[model samples]
Target: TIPHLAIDPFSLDFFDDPYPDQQTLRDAGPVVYLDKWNVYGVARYAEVHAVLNDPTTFCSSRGVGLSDFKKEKPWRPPSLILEADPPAHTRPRAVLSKVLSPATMKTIRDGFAAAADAKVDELLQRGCIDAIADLAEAYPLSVFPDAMGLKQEGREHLLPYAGLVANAFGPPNELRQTAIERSAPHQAYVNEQCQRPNLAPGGFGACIHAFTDTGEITPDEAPLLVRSLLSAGLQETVNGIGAAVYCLARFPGELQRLRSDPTLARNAFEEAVRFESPVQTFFRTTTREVELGGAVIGEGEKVLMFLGSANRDPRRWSDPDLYDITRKTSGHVGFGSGVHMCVGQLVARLEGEVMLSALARKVAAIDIDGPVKRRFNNTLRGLESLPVKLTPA
Candidate 1:
């Protein structure tokens, strides 16, 4: 009665280079049944928009990870913010949204731009650099913590804590064990940082505790909710920036366009989210029987929304794979669609705009040496190291 699309969610060929597969899935229909996962996949713009905005029908509560929260191993408690759906998801998002809003993020704009510019200037003085770690990691870790009201130590530990938690999401294996072992030293600090006493007065963490203190949400739920923002916030920006830099570098004249105009920075970052899509995929659970793409659905089935796929669907865009800075991509699903769309996209966007704009302002060119290396995870496409040469203007 139903047609099959792909084999396994983690097959090597699917993982190796997925655009062809994405084209295949999108061409199949609005929603394709991945026989292996037995979950409906929303492979195009229209369907993904429906799934993201209508969280009531496609719940995130059972958990978005491979293991539904009900069946997941007790690693850390689920993100009270990211793991929740509407009504329950509303309060925390509103509280943090106000706290980390673009206006509030505006206060740090000059500081962040300056920090990134200084790094780019320093790198340009050196002639060539590994853009990924040198510029990407250095820039965001510089400002995000200061904005979050985290101390130096707490800021330093954020990445490792998040790395372990994210690793625990995938199928448990050697990599997961290594991630846990590597994060062991930082766990105690993370526990402390999540507590009220350790929260900085006006930072995002303190704001979460304030919600709890006011009795809007249980005290138990505050830290994990706050942790979700910190976890999702940093690495995703770093990946986007790295990918953007790689794109501008590889594409002959784009870097020049960026250097000539600062506004292109927004398009650069957006096109990267649309193109490379650092946050690759997320899972959703169906609440009732529904016919998505004309297929009969059973209640309580897990669906994979291939965000990366939707962003590149040929039917949706003129040239899906080509990077264009001037296109009006307002309806793009890069931040997602609908109710459960990323609540903190402004946070990530501000970070990208600041850093990318700064780099665009200072560097005349960025190029790779040897080959760019990628650090891949099931849900993220990240760079390990990308050697880049930036010529200063």
Candidate 2:
């Protein structure tokens, strides 16, 4: 029998400081049963990687959260890309792949770079600012929405909608309930904005709609595909940028390393993703009876993969806890792995690289100026407020 552990991974107490519990889970065993949620968890690097890579055995069609679609009604229509398995996943995935292709990245690069430079200039002038609001949230909110061609009027709903999506992934607790209560306006705004008429010509949304002409996807599916982009595109990148800045502020030595070579900005951001892992856990259901790490799990059992823990597994990374920008963090599950790996990662990487490179060129030091506040979400990890003083280079 797998070692049984009773730990509430979703409680506010766990969110405030998850590292201790994550360490406990990682050391407990490869596969442990979480009696709190009545699910199995994989915390070690190798096992998590193995499970993610073998998506056939560990399926996503059930739902990537604690709630199984087989048993309960999904709060929203299941994401065609995020929730579907195999042949069903292939077509829409292709449409999204084309919409966010290298060509699109090239088209957006110069505009993103200019915005990054302008944002950095504003921060340098202010001297002290909330890095989460002033830099992380501000930069991505400015670019990504424009890229998706979303109207500026109700854009404030974007983050709240993302919060709803992330929180809903866990058990339907107070957090999920509160998010649901507050989500009506956000839901309506997002739904309207995703429609073809609301999207601007020459934007990512337009590109997705164009797929309908080729019958690559149906016209009805176009809005949901756009919804997929809107649902995922912002919050993760915002938190990722926030995580990178927080990492730099906490480890001045790493900031110095970044300053020495602004070219290392991309690696710095990637390292922070590994170190702080904005997207913490995702559940995969077993397709059939399988033995994982010497423990036999029945078909349809939900298995929670601790992505953050796997990124820091000492067996995979040297000095796993240390924030080292120069560390080789290639195979980290921070963005997940396998066929279901994060598709928007390049766009997020572009945003991170642009912001950090601009910062390294203009800022001499990143010093924490006030109390840092944490933003609690069931799945995502980020700061709510990060006050910092950026010394001009």
Task: Encode model 2's per-residue lDDT on 267-349: one tens digit a residue.
Answer: 99999899889999999999999988999999999999999989989888899989898888799999999888988988999
Q: What is the lDDT of residue 85 in candidate 2?
A: 91
Candidate 2's TM-score: 0.99
Clashes found in each candidate (C-alpha, N, C closer than 3 A): 3, 0
For model 2, the run of ten residues with the poorest summed lDDT: 208-217
lDDT of each: 0.75, 0.92
Cα lDDT, model 1, residue 170? 50
lDDT of 2 at 272: 87
Q: State residue 314's C-alpha deviation in candidate 1, in Å.
A: 1.5
Error of 2 at 134 (Å): 0.9
Model 1 superposed RMSD (Cα): 2.2
Q: What is candidate 1's lDDT per residue for 94-136, written digit by digit as tens?
A: 7777777777777767777788777777888888788887877
Best by the lDDT measure: 2
Q: Which residue segments of model 2 deviate by more than 4 Å?
A: none
Residue 342 of model 1: what lDDT? 78
Q: Highest TM-score: give the candidate number.
A: 2
